[PDB]
Each structure stands twice: as structure tokens, then as C-alpha cells.
């Protein structure tokens, strides 16, 4: 039940206790980032590549019946027109634009293509490979029947009505989610040697997806319609694992949301409940670094656990959420990771969930470090988003002079 012991985020690798925010920021945070890079996700080999190019391919000022401006942007990772790229979809609420104010942004990757997040027939159909599990796909390619096929996870009209822009990119633009996807990924292009077997500490899909989120943020910093200092990075499940790693590595993200990210996301690995290190690496060998396989059936040897990933978001707001029936993600483990990260949030004057057991369903708990568990199976629902929008309202207010 409790057959593990966690490393203390506030004890340095040399045993010295971290007593102050400066030691956390300038020594302990780099230590932990290097541990997760080497042992779990793999190294992010560079941040912004030189020669990133942003091309707005479509712009509609009266999308969604006039409610939004919709922009599609190709973010190309080098100057040569042949360089790899990703396709960003952005809806911005026209009520905010009309007031001549920059909108805060929710940014997250999608599972099956930009055209799946909303029925809107003007969104470009992805030309990229799509998994067999994608609704209404045909031989691994998008079809018009797939439009809006993942819209329940994306309540665009509500987010816009609440004053937030919505930005998304298909994860498969960055690394196709298939065990062979790394060879057709931006990793195959970025700081790679002669294309053979990747190195032990080389990043995999989660690292690549996370890097893509930071490149989307680079684009948002240039877009006059949005406030790139108020970007909430979010993800569901495997894309929440990526949102957490993006938010931990890139402290420009103003707020981070993990929706049911489970093993190698928010859930403690040392708890051995639901999905385990061996199970995740065996089924998804491209997700983590090869070095993470050292801990298959040996989670006791992990030098970190996921509470320390959560702690890397501090002092910025972080929301971890679970589903009651989602045993595979280990909801208790996700909550206990929040509780074990809370001392770092407290060092920074924030507060986490009250209580030392999982709260009752649909009752969020915590300040800037917040948790809820909703009824039902794994997914991302309107109820999850209602809670996330309330959190963002509290923790993403436009900055005024201090
Ligand atoms: O992406 C999802 O929904 C989930 O898919 C699989 O079940 C995987 O085992 C999980 O780690 C992941 O979170
Ligand atoms: Mg688990």
C-alpha cells in the first residue's frame, strides 16, 4: 500500500537542505532538471533553433459565427523551406480583440489533428500520419469525417467566452505517436549524429512534444493578439506528460495543467499502482529515454519521483487532476505526488490541497497548487475544463504595474 520512500525535493543531491527560494531556483532546480533529462525523458538538446520561421497561412476574423479570429500558422524550425515544421491553430475571442486587449492563452497538443478539435470546416485537414485509433480515419490519414471528432476534449466556445484564446498543434507533427515515430520526428533532424540507434540519454516523444509546446510559445510571443506572458500549458494523458515536462523546463509558461497524466506524468512511479515503468516502456518504447528502462521493475532505484517534476513548476500555478475510475493513471498516486511537491510550493508562499487524503469528487482543493478528481473514466471533460477556467481566472489575471 505504501511500499516506497520518496526522495525529498528540499534535500540537495549532496545532502544539504534547501532553505530558501534562491537555492531552489539556482541550484536544486538545475539538479532536478538534469536528473529528469538523464534518467526519465532524455535530454532536450537545444531550445529555440536558429532560423525559426513563422508563416500565417490563413486568417479569419469572423470564425465561429463571429465569435473568434482563427489563425493557422506554420512554425518552421529552420529557414530552408524544406525544414520540418508544425501547424498551429489559434482561436482568439473577438470580444477581447475588439477591446484592443491581448488575450491570455490555453495551449495544448491534440491527439488526432487540429481538424479534430472543432467541427469548423475551414481548419486545414492534417496531411500527416494519424494513428489507427483516431476516429473516422482512413489508412492513417485524416478524412473530412474526422472533423470535430475530438471536440469534447476542447470546449472552444466556452474558453473563448471566458476570455481566453485556444492554441493547439497535433502531437504527430512533432513525433508521430507510434513506436517507429522518432525516425520521422524533429528529433531525427535536431542535433542527431549519423541516423542510427538513439543514445541512452536521447529524448523520445514526450521530450519532443514538450519542445514543440515551447516552440508554440515562441510563436505566441510574436502574435499581437495574445499575451504570451499568460499562457496556460495543458495536456491530457500522454499529452499531459508532455505539458508537465514543458512547463517544468520552460518557466515562461505561466500556468501548467496535467489532466490525468498518470505514469511518468503526475503519478508517483515508486507506488507501483496501475501503469508501471515496465509497462509504459514496453508498450511505448519511444516515449521516454532508453535510460528510463533501467527502472523497469526497479522503481526503488529511481533517484527522483514525479513529485519533483511537479515541484519544478513552483512558484507558478500547477493543476493536477484525476478521474475516479482511472485506476491505470493511479489517481491516489497523482494526489500524493501533489502532496509531496507541496513543501516546495510552500517555500514560495503558495498553498496546496488541504488534507492528506484524496478529496471528494468534484471538490477541487488547493491554492496555486490545485487538485481535483471527477467521477467517471479517463478522459477530459467539460467538468475538468470548468475547474481549469476557474483556476485560470484566479491565477492568470493581466499583470498591472507593481
Ligand atoms: O494517453 C493516454 O490516454 C494514456 O494511454 C495509455 O493508456 C498509456 O498507458 C497512458 O500512460 C496514457 O496516459
Ligand atoms: Mg502507476
Numbering used by the authors: 31 to 432
Question: From the publication, what sentences describe this entry?
Answer:
Glucuronyl esterases (GEs)4 are enzymes able to cleave ester linkages connecting lignin to glucuronoxylan in the plant cell wall. GEs belong to the α/β-hydrolase superfamily and possess a catalytic triad common with serine-type hydrolases. OtCE15A is an interesting member of CE15 and the α/β-hydrolase superfamily in that it features acidic residues at both the canonical and noncanonical positions (Glu-290 and Asp-356). Here, we have investigated by mutagenesis the residues involved in catalysis and carbohydrate binding in the enzyme OtCE15A and, furthermore, present a series of structures of OtCE15A with different ligands, including monosaccharides and, for the first time in CE15, di- and oligosaccharides.
An S267A-GlcA complex structure was determined to high resolution (1.12 Å) and showed that in the absence of the catalytic serine, the glucuronate binds identically as in the WT protein. Notably, this high-resolution structure facilitated the observation of both glucuronate anomers being present.
